[PDB]
């Protein structure tokens, strides 16, 4: 039993100033390849959307 990605899991940021934090995936877009997750950024939510190819699975 393997999965590629699931719902309301974390994944972590791709790189730049916000290589080093993760997300909570409330929706996603398989038709398109979107993701999106509420990152925390300076000790506060921070709501963004992103992609496969700027995340990672953790």
Do not use: C, H, K, T
């Given at each position: 039993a393997q999965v590629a990605f699931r719902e309301g899991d974390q994944v972590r940021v791709v790189?730049?100033?916000?290589?080093d934090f993760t997300g909570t995936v409330t929706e996603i877009n398989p038709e398109r390849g979107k993701v999106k997750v509420m990152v925390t950024i300076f000790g506060r939510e921070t709501p963004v959307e992103l992609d496969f190819s700027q995340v990672v699975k953790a």
């Open positions: 790189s730049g100033p916000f290589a």
